[PDB]
Every structure is written in structure tokens, then in C-alpha cells.
Nucleic acid binder design. Structure first.
Lengths: 122, 197, 127, 167, 111, 106
RNA sequence: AAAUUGUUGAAAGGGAAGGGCAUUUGAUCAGACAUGGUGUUUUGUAUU
RNA sequence: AUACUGCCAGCUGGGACUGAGGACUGCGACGUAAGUCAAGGAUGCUGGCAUAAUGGUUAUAUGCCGCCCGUCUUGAAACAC
RNA sequence: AACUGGCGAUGCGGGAUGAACCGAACGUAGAGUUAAGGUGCCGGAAUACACGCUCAUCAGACACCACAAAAGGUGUUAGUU
RNA sequence: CCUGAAAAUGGAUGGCGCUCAAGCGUGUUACCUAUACUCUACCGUCAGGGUUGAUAUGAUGCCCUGACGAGUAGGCAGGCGUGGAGGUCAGUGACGAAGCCUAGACCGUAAGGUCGGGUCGAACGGCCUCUAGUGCAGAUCUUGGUGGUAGUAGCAAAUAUU
RNA sequence: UUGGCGGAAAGGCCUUGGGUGCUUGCUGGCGAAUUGCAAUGUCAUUUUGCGUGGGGAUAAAUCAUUUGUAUACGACUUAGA
């Protein structure tokens, strides 16, 4: 959602030219981040390995106003509220190992070859 | 079917050579063409000069930087001749064009290597004797190529180094002939003669 | 067990999708014949989708057969299995979707007892 | 339900085939290969190896030997379409060949449970090899270079054109 | 059309290879002497060669014998038409019209 | 010695095609050293294999194969017509093919 | 439910995308030598 | 006693696609007498693999091809709606 | 306006492209031949064979068809008196 | 072959390029490939026929033979699906009906039918028939809901705020 | 290992010395077999790991601040332990 917004050097660190400072969005996310950190503290989590593992903003129902246009016309003047949710988890180690055993199917000629290679080799 | 076929363009017709190479590239033969400046076009120099001026006319009217790009180097003129014989806008055509390299003179990786000719495209085999023809180097210079004089000095260098190797080659081969003359009248050589060798 | 059954590879295994059902959401994929005056599909232009035609019809002695060679009969109860008793090599039972799990066990037991192949003898359980 | 019993019924018993008029006539082998001819194998474990042709077997299959002493190819049987017959011929007179047949190479196939989860030669078979090879070697020595001929595996070389290549 | 004068060889080959009788408005392959005798026996034509004979040497019962034969369904010529363009007269280097004896080569390669 | 070839070097040239319609079920194959139809008759009926590699080992191999046969000759210049068990992918135009010496007649 | 949206995740992308035939590659899946030589040498022997 | 033409129910090879179809019949061929056969449509033998290997689906890539549908109209992809 | 064949109502191969031209009209597949049109490369198919002719400081290059004329040239070739 | 021969964006023997041609006239072959021709399989349609045979096979059943298949406007036929009605399956079902989602499966040329998995909570199907307010992509269609545009146009008259 | 040569894209060529294998130049001994009558029947790199170990010299850009030779914003020109 960056069409025809301004450019800045503070987007260089992200490899963009277009960036902004959404104060109201940042404050709301800060209040949610604080709620999540408080939720983790009451959950006994480490609270120094916590990272934003899930975060998502979708549209809450529109708050509807109206705006007056030329020649006695009315248009919508709508808010686009947000549902925000996020999940903070602490970073862990490798999840698992031991990939597939992959039960092998060889033909008769394949078995004879490796048996011949095995005796040829040492 | 060789891994790379290196053709020298000297005394070759650009169109017929472009046709042969394009077929080889499509069939999977990597090709490099050297001596692009000594390539030939049929017709007098004035004819082929006028034709490139006609090609020079064509350009996008509202922005000349998107129109046809008129490459002046003799290697690029051959490349243009070949790209017209390849479906270059398809992925298969890009792959065939990648298998081709064109050079003026012979850059270092190829003046130690074998050079072949295409009899279908050779000028002394194709053109009727007495018929006027254009050398690519002179044509390219006239339309704005800058490196004819540079190539001539670097080609003179390569040739004179190439002359020493051949005289060395003749030196090494004559020692075989005279030593084989003394190792001659052998039963093995007689037996091979009876057996086709 | 048998002969190498007909319908070897293909007559037309691809779905006949409705034209422009890939273009608009409102156009469902259920086959509809284009009736337009200018339709490239109706006029059979090269490079367009194929329309269903009676020539695609399957061999009569293989038509309606599963890959196993049995025809599938929908069965709602054990009594619906009586018709399949003596034709276990040409028919197979399919337990209807709305049969309870307790009654599904009974139909499975009877079909296995008389050697009736069931097309879906694994519903309502895991392996 | 739709129907208590379908109005039409299929067949219960399995149809019997009718009498096929296809008699199995003997194979007509090509003339290039006669017993004693040096062959070249084109496929299998011994692809490219040179073995002499010994006998035409009952299952349309050539019987050949290296000899095993010469190139490691035992008394074996090959498909006639997977060999190349050459003009080099050693006389097959002196080696008895009447004891070889399809029953000679009876297999005793493996069982399904026998499976290579991780990854012998009969005395008569090897003794038969020692009899055929000594009789066939004894004739190989009459042509010089032939024992060295039979050891070298065949390969195509850059420029070798099989349609023009005479064997 | 292309037409001309067929010899005995091509008529024999036409009837043997592509010979079908019009029987009950149906195109049934000849394939047997009985099939001709059952339909043309009243005219004395009892064998396939009896039918061929009534065609090559135009006999009194040619019309019945010829109409009994279904129209012959030939292939395109095996080696081509021998000309770049069919739809000129044979005399003009085309293919249509009367080629007197050269119909035999064209038909045999089509049959 | 160092040479171990028993097949003939061949190039997959294209599908059988008209100007604008191609038939993938038939492939046109060049045989190395064959420039006339008469020399191509030797290879009629001979087995062909397009040999290619895949990153996933399937049945103890990372090398997969499609088999075929030389069915007839094509044109005047030694190209032959070939059909494969599965048609060739058409990214293999210009790719190498192996024409074997079996089934053999010499 | 759909449109529309945040979007397990996968994939593709040099001036649209989408489609048809064909194969390849990836992913994914249905169908199969389970009881019928002995009327039965083992195997919880009327469970074959 | 021959690069031409015609004919042969003359001969000898090399490739390809197809195998439809019965619980029992027809027309024929071949030896001088157990009957066989290439005669109203494939069998015999031999391997490998009982698994995603073949195949179905779907995504991509590749080759070639593919203008936006409805409508009125002689004529629509239309710079017609 | 006449006769016919077409397009409209029709895809398919060819004429790059195109309602009508050429070829051929269409169930779903396979093999073999072809049509019209082609076979330097794009592009499947002879940079084949044979005899000539033409060099253009705007060559020419295939019906419908996407144009060119009168008049001229010891340019070149053949021919007539 | 050349002159005659002048038009407007850059440009089209289809393009490249071609000069004892890859040009032009002609001859001879070889070769390429259409949904056309030949042959074979399978679908359908139509036509012409056979069949009252045993303690298994409703005769609109079973079977044999041949030909044919383009289609707008339009006609007809056989079917697919929807709401309700009579009859039946002494049908399915809270041990889960209906509905919905599912680049899962099967069947049918198709309309669609069946089924696996998920969600779900009270009804609902098959078959023989009856009946109709019975099938949508369009009507600048109706009502409702929602996009791209787009965090864009903009939120600058009335002196001015700290 | 010693001498050179090669800048067009050299990135590769020739080398004098030692060691070290092989050598089918010629003649022997032993082995191979059952991959079952074919099945590519598998023989040549980019990149990764709290990989292995033998070495190797221990930086900058960007934001922010600043500048006006620059500037709609970005961008630019400067300065700044």
C-alpha cells in the first residue's frame, strides 16, 4: 500500500525508496506488543528470546460517515478499521532431524551390479 | 559433432554462412566465428553501403533509443544476419543464440585452436568469377566502426606468431620423415601396406 | 486373473470445462455449450477447448466400469447387498455418504463375508 | 433404492477363447552367424565383448562362449538380435555341444520374500566351461592374434560409422 | 477424374484387393466365390474370375456384374501423382482426363 | 581403452510438424555420419534412448531414460523418424540421443 | 457461500495474464500375485 | 543379344502401425491312408517389477498453436453496443 | 441484373496476415499416402540435378493480391531481313 | 536489365538474407505435410435382418450386417438437474439429515451423479408416477454486498498565532 | 623443479632436471561366470553444515547530525571520534 507516497533515504536499509512513519498504526501495534509481552510474562516465557512469529492485519467493518460533493451530491467518507492479532514465541533450536528412510527398490540387474562393484572395490 | 566448431569468416559470404551457422546452433552445435571483418558480401561496396544506410534510416520515430539498434562492428553485422535466421524471441531461440560467439580477428582462446571453413559459404567456391563483392571490414568502417586499424595490427601480430609455430611444425615433421626413412623397409610397414595402411 | 482390459490409456480423460470459466468467477465449470454467433469455441477454431461429443463415448463392454473392472452400486443397508451377491466379479458396492458409522461396520462385514468389493471400505476410520 | 435387481445381467462364467491358428514355426536365423563365428555383444553385462558363437538353442537363443579363459565370459546364451556376427570364424569341430539346452540353464527363480534390504557356481557348469574352453582355445591358437583379438572389448571410435563398418 | 484403359492385371488386382459386392444395399467383401454366385449366378457368374472376366472382356452381363461391384475405394497413389499440379489435363502435364494406358500405373499405385 | 561407445551419436532435432502444427508423437532424429537416406536405412528399427539426469534418485538411479525406435527415414538428408515410449519433452531439441546397434542384422 | 482481504506454504514472472495438444520435472492419488496344484508341509491346526 | 515399356497367381531381403473377435460350426490348402495348416481377427517363449514403477490429477517449464464474450449485422478482436 | 459455386451457417491444410481465393468440408483415435502449397535459415522438406538469362549508385522473387504506362538505351542475349 | 518512376512516423519478396542465387524461364526427379483418401479400433445414428433353443438368459431382451457423422435461425428426440404431490424402498439420520469448503477418488461424451476428508446440527433421499412461480453471464437488469482506483484527489477564501 | 613465452578476452603454452607409476614393443600364469537372453544399468560440478585442518593480512557503508557548488521528494556535494 505504497502507491504515490513519498520517497526517503530512511527506506534504504530495507532496499526500498518508499517508506513512512505511521504513528497511529505504530502506537496500536505497540499496545498489542505490550499486551503480548505481558501475556508471555504471565505464561512464564523467557521474555528475551521472544520474537514476532505471527502478525496479521485484516479489515474490521467500515465505520461509515458521509462527505458532501458538488451539485448536491453525497459520497461515502469511510473509516477502514483494523483487526490486528499477533503471536510472540521464543526462538528455539532445530525442530527435528532423521529424514526419510526411503525403502529402496532395485531390479535384479541393479543388485548384480553393486555386488560386482563391491567385490571390485574394497 | 564437435564440442565447439570454430570457423574463420575470411572469404565467406555473410548470408550463406549465417544460414549454415544458424542451422548448426539450432541442432545443438556450439559455434564461434572469427575474422568477422574479412567476411564477404556479394555486390560492390557501394551497393552494400547503401543497404546499411537504408537500415540506418529505420528507427523508432518518437524515441530513437527503442528502435532498431544499428550495430556497426563486423561481428555484430554477422550476428544480425544470423539472428534473423533464428526464432530469437522464443526460449529455444535464445538458447541457440547463446551457443554462438562472433569475434573480429581471433581472440587468444582460439588462435591456438583449429579453424574450419564452410564450402557452402566460401566466396571462391560460390560467386561466379569476376563478380564484385564487399569485404565486411571496409563496410563496417564506412558506417562507423572504429577498430579496423587496431585489428589489422593485432592480426598482423597473431599471424607472425602463427608463422613461427608452423615453421616449428615443419621442423618437427621433417625429423619424422627422415627418421622414418631410416626406420623404413620394416616388415611392420610392409604388412600394413598389404592391409590398407 | 482376466484379459488385459480395454480402455488402455485415453479417449478423453480431461474435464470438459466451460469456456471462460477460467476467466470469470461467475462462470462455473459445469459444461455449457457456447451459443454465441461469433464464439471461437462453438466454431471449433484451432487452439480452443474441445466440446463434448458422442465420439468420445466409451466402449460399451467397458463403459461404467471402475479401474478394477467392477461397476459401482450405491448401497444404503445390508439388504442392498443382496443384488451384488452372485456378481462379485462385475459389481462393487459403494456405501452411501449418509450411513452411520455403526451401520457402516455392518455393511462392511456383510460385503466382506460374501466377497463383495467395496469402493470406500475405509471411511470413518484412520490407518 | 434404485432397483432391487437390474433388468439386464452380465455373464457369470469366464468366456473361453476359440482355437487360435498360430503354430510356432522354428526361427530362421540369419546367414552371417554359423557355429564357430566370432560375435560382438551389444548389451548386457558383457556388452562390447567378443565371444564365439557355439550353438543354436531351442528357445531361439544363441549359445556362446568367450572362452571364459580368454575374456571372462562363461558358457552363456545370448539373444541373436543383440549380437553382431563377424567374418572371423574358428572351427567348432572338436568341442562337444550336444548337452546344452534350456533345461541346462534352469534357473530356480528367487522368492518374493527374498529382498535385498542391505544391498555359488555349480561344479558341472564350471567343469563344462573347462571342457569347452580348452577345445576351443586349441583351435584359437591356429590363427595368430586371435586370442588377443577375443580379449579386447569392442567399442566405437570417433568417426566409426557402423552402417559402413564391415565386421 | 483421371481415367483410361485398364489391363487385365489391374482389374484382377482391383477386384482381389478392393472388391465388394452390393448385396441388400450393403457393401460386403467378396472374399469368397459363394458371395458372387449367390448374387450373380443367374447370369452365370460363379467365381471372382468369372466376375473379372465379365469386366475385362465386356460381356453381355457387364451392367449387372459392374453394378454389383461397389465403387472401388482407392488410396492416394503410393509414389504420388507424378505431377506438381493435379488439376490440369494429363496432356498439359496435369493429372485429369484420359490417360490411355497410363491409368494402370496410377491405379496400381493407388490400389 | 578409453573409448567405450557401442551406440551411435544422434541429435533430437524436432517433432514432426507442418509450418504451424507439430506432432509430438513423432521425433526427428539426426544420426552422426549419415547424410543420405540410403545410409539411414541401416538404422531403421534400431532402439534409441534419450538419457537424462534428475536430482531425485527414483529406483537406485539419478539417470532416467525414455526408449524409442527409428521407424523410418525423413527427407533426403539422413534424418530419421522416431517414436518413443513417451514423447520427448521438446526442451531436448538439439539434445543428444543414443542410437544403439540392436536389434542387429549384421 | 461468493466477491473482496490478512494471507500454512508452494510455484512462476525481461512490455499482460489466462487456454489447447504433447512430454518432462515437482507434488499428489486410485486401481493390484492377499482365500481357488494339494480339496490343504509349518503360521492364534470350523479362522485357510 | 543391351540405361525402354508391359506382365509374372517370380524369388530373396530390411523397417513401421494394428491383434478387433465364440461353452462347439464356414470356405479352402497340403502327403498315395494317424492328420496338420499362414484357411470366418495373436499366439508361444523369456525377462524385470506387486510399486507411484506405468498411469490419473494438478503446478511449472518447453515446442507449436490460441484476439473478448454476449448482441445486432453481408461482414466484429474491433477505433460498434 | 443472368447462370453457377460459395460465404452468411464452416472449422481444417495453403495464400505471412484476410468471410468469400486454392485444397479439402469436420464423431473419437492409430498407421500409411496425398491435395493445394512448399523444401538456404526462420520451418517439416534437395544450399538437388539440367540448360540458359540477368548485375540494378530505386534488381527480382509466384494466381486472387495488395499496381505501373507510353516512350527510349551499340547494356547484354537470341532472332529476321 | 536500366531510364521513364515524386509524399509525407521507421519498414517490409512475411523476415533474414540471397548474385554461375536462395533471382527469372523451363525440364527431371526426390522429399515434406490437412480434420481429405486407404486400412483398423471404439462411440453414436440410421437402415436391413436373425432369434419361442436345452431343470439360468422380461423379445422395445439378446444378436448379425452395412452405411453414415459440418452446422447459424429453426424443428424434433433421448436424457440431466430444482420446488411441491400420490405410491413404494416396513430407505438415510443426533452413533450426525440438510447446507457449505476441499489443484482427494470414481462414473458419465455431457447435463451431472456417487464417494473420501473437514465444517455442521434436524431433518432428508432412491425408484414408479403427478405437478410447476423449475435451471442465468450478460437485460446502461432488481435488491444487497464488495473491489481496483488509493492511503490517492484532497482536507489552501474569511490577516494569526505564540 | 629449473628457464622462459603469451594482454585482443592473456589465465594458457613450451620447458631443463629428479622421483614416481604404467607401458599392448614382445612372451607368460591367475582372475572374471548367476547383471541369469536387453533394460543409461549409474564412471566428468555449483553450493551447505555448532564440517575436517594447513595458512592468511583483522573494514566499511547507511540512517541520524551537517553542508549548499545540489535539491519537489528521493538523489547530489561536503563536514563531522
Amino acid at each position: 500500500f505504497n502507491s504515490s507516497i513519498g520517497r526517503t533515504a530512511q527506506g534504504k536499509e530495507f532496499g526500498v525508496t518508499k517508506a513512512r512513519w505511521p504513528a497511529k498504526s505504530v502506537k496500536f501495534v505497540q499496545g498489542l506488543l505490550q499486551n503480548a509481552a505481558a501475556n508471555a510474562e504471565a505464561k512464564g516465557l523467557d521474555a528475551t528470546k521472544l520474537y514476532v512469529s505471527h502478525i496479521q492485519v485484516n479489515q474490521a467493518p467500515k465505520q461509515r460517515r458521509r462527505t458532501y460533493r458538488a451539485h448536491g451530491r453525497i459520497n461515502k467518507y469511510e473509516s477502514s478499521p483494523s483487526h490486528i492479532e499477533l503471536v510472540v514465541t521464543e526462538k528455539e533450536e532445530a525442530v527435528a532431524k532423521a529424514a526419510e528412510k526411503k525403502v529402496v527398490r532395485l531390479t535384479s540387474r541393479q543388485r548384480g551390479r553393486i555386488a560386482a562393484q563391491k567385490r571390485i572395490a574394497a | 559433432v564437435e564440442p565447439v566448431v570454430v570457423i574463420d569468416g575470411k572469404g565467406h559470404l555473410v548470408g550463406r554462412l549465417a544460414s549454415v551457422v544458424a542451422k548448426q546452433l539450432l541442432n545443438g552445435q556450439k559455434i564461434v566465428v572469427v575474422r568477422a571483418e574479412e567476411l564477404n558480401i556479394s555486390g560492390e561496396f557501394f551497393r552494400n553501403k547503401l543497404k546499411y544506410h537504408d537500415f540506418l534510416r529505420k528507427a523508432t520515430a518518437f524515441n530513437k533509443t527503442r528502435g532498431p539498434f544499428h550495430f556497426r562492428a563486423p561481428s555484430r553485422i554477422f550476428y544480425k544476419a544470423l539472428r534473423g535466421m533464428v526464432s530469437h524471441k522464443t526460449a529455444r531461440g535464445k538458447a541457440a543464440l547463446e551457443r554462438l560467439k562472433v569475434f573480429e580477428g581471433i581472440p587468444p582462446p582460439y588462435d591456438k585452436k583449429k579453424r574450419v571453413v564452410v564450402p557452402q559459404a566460401l566466396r571462391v567456391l560460390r560467386l561466379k568469377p569476376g563478380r564484385k563483392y564487399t569485404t565486411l571490414g571496409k563496410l563496417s568502417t564506412s558506417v562507423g566502426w572504429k577498430y579496423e586499424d587496431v585489428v589489422a595490427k593485432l592480426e598482423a601480430k597473431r599471424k607472425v606468431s602463427s608463422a613461427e609455430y608452423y615453421a616449428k611444425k615443419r621442423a618437427f615433421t621433417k625429423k619424422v620423415a627422415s627418421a622414418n626413412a631410416t626406420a623404413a623397409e620394416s616388415d611392420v610397414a610392409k604388412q600394413l601396406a598389404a592391409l590398407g595402411y | 486373473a482376466s484379459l488385459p482390459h480395454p480402455k488402455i490409456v485415453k479417449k478423453h480423460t480431461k474435464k470438459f470445462k466451460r469456456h471462460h470459466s477460467d476467466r470469470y468467477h461467475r462462470v462455473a465449470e459445469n459444461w455449457r455449450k457456447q451459443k454465441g454467433i461469433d464464439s471461437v469455441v462453438r466454431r471449433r477454431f484451432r487452439g480452443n477447448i474441445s466440446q463434448p461429443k458422442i465420439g468420445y463415448g466409451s466402449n460399451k463392454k467397458t463403459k461404467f466400469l471402475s479401474p478394477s473392472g467392477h461397476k459401482t452400486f450405491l448401497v444404503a443397508n445390508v439388504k442392498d447387498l443382496e443384488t451384488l451377491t452372485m456378481h462379485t466379479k462385475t459389481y462393487a458396492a459403494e456405501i452411501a455418504h449418509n450411513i452411520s458409522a455403526k451401520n457402516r461396520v455392518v455393511i462392511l462385514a456383510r460385503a466382506k463375508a460374501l466377497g463383495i468389493k467395496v469402493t470406500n471400505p475405509k471411511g470413518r476410520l484412520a490407518l | 433404492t434404485a432397483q432391487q435387481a437390474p433388468k439386464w445381467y452380465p455373464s457369470e462364467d469366464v468366456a473361453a477363447p476359440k482355437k487360435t491358428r498360430k503354430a510356432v514355426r522354428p526361427q530362421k536365423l540369419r546367414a552371417s552367424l554359423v557355429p564357430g563365428t566370432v560375435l560382438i555383444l551389444l548389451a548386457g553385462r558383457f556388452r562390447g565383448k567378443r565371444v564365439v558363437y557355439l550353438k543354436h538353442l531351442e528357445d531361439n537363443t544363441l549359445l556362446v562362449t568367450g572362452p571364459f579363459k580368454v575374456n571372462g565370459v562363461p558358457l552363456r546364451r545370448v539373444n541373436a538380435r543383440y549380437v553382431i556376427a563377424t567374418s572371423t570364424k574358428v572351427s567348432v569341430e572338436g568341442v562337444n555341444v550336444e548337452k546344452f539346452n534350456v533345461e541346462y540353464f534352469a534357473k530356480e527363480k528367487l522368492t518374493k520374500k527374498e529382498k535385498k534390504e542391505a544391498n555359488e557356481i555349480k561344479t558341472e557348469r564350471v567343469e563344462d566351461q573347462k571342457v569347452v574352453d580348452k577345445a576351443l582355445l586349441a583351435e584359437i591358437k591356429k590363427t595368430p592374434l586371435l586370442k588377443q583379438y577375443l580379449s579386447a572389448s569392442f567399442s566405437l571410435k570417433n568417426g566409426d560409422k557402423p552402417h559402413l563398418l564391415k565386421f | 477424374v483421371a481415367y483410361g484403359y485398364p489391363s487385365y492385371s489391374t482389374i484382377r488386382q482391383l477386384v482381389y484387393k478392393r472388391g465388394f459386392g452390393k448385396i441388400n444395399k450393403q457393401r460386403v467383401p467378396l472374399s469368397d466365390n459363394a458371395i458372387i454366385e449367390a448374387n450373380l449366378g443367374k447370369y452365370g457368374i460363379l467365381s471372382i474370375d468369372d466376375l473379372i472376366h465379365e469386366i475385362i472382356t465386356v460381356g453381355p452381363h457387364f451392367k449387372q456384374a459392374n453394378n454389383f461391384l461397389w465403387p472401388f475405394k482407392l488410396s492416394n497413389p503410393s509414389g504420388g501423382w507424378g505431377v506438381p499440379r493435379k488439376f490440369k489435363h494429363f496432356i498439359q502435364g496435369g493429372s485429369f482426363g484420359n490417360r490411355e494406358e497410363f491409368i494402370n500405373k496410377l491405379v496400381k499405385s493407388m490400389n | 581403452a578409453e573409448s567405450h561407445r557401442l551406440y551411435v551419436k544422434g541429435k533430437h532435432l524436432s517433432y514432426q510438424r507442418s509450418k504451424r502444427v507439430n506432432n509430438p508423437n513423432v521425433s526427428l532424429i539426426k544420426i552422426e555420419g549419415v547424410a543420405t537416406p540410403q545410409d539411414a536405412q541401416f538404422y531403421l528399427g534400431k532402439r534409441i534412448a534419450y538419457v537424462y539426469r534428475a536430482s531425485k534418485e527414483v529406483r537406485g538411479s539419478k539417470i532416467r531414460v525414455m526408449w524409442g525406435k527409428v521407424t523410418r527415414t525423413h527427407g533426403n538428408s539422413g534424418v530419421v523418424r522416431a517414436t518413443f515410449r513417451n514423447n520427448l519433452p521438446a526442451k531436448t531439441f538439439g539434445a543428444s540421443v543414443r542410437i544403439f546397434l540392436y536389434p542387429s542384422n549384421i
